[PDB]
Amino acid sequence: QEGSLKTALTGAMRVTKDENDNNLYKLHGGHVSCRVKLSALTLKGTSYKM
Amino acid sequence: QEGSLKTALTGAMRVTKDELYKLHGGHVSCRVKLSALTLKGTSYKM
């Protein structure tokens, strides 16, 4: 029943696996919502000559 | 895809083999002639 399952599982969110890590499952889906703090970010060489 | 074919072929006329393919299904319309039959010994003693 490999074929019947695979045709039934077409278009389903996929999971893959790493190198040696054999219980580390990568989830091909979802997204992340982030808030980034920028005030402590500075330029270099603003007082360089042209 | 072996399972997928087998689900599709549930309720199919079946075939078998030996060593020739045997068709499991259908009937033979026969006409039987009986006038050439005889009883052995209608003149034995009871």
Look up residue A13 and give its two tokens. Answer: 């969110």
Strand partners, A17: A25
Question: Which residue of chain B comes nearest to A4, CA vs CA?
Answer: B4
Residue A37: phi, psi to the nearest 5? -100, 120
Among candidates B41, B24, B8, B2, which has minimal Cα distance to A6?
B2
From CA B41, how far away is CA B46, in angstroms rounded?
A: 11
| Model resolution, angstroms | 2.8
CB contact under 8 A, A3 and B1: yes
Give A35's contacts (C-beta < 8 A, 6+ positions apart).
none
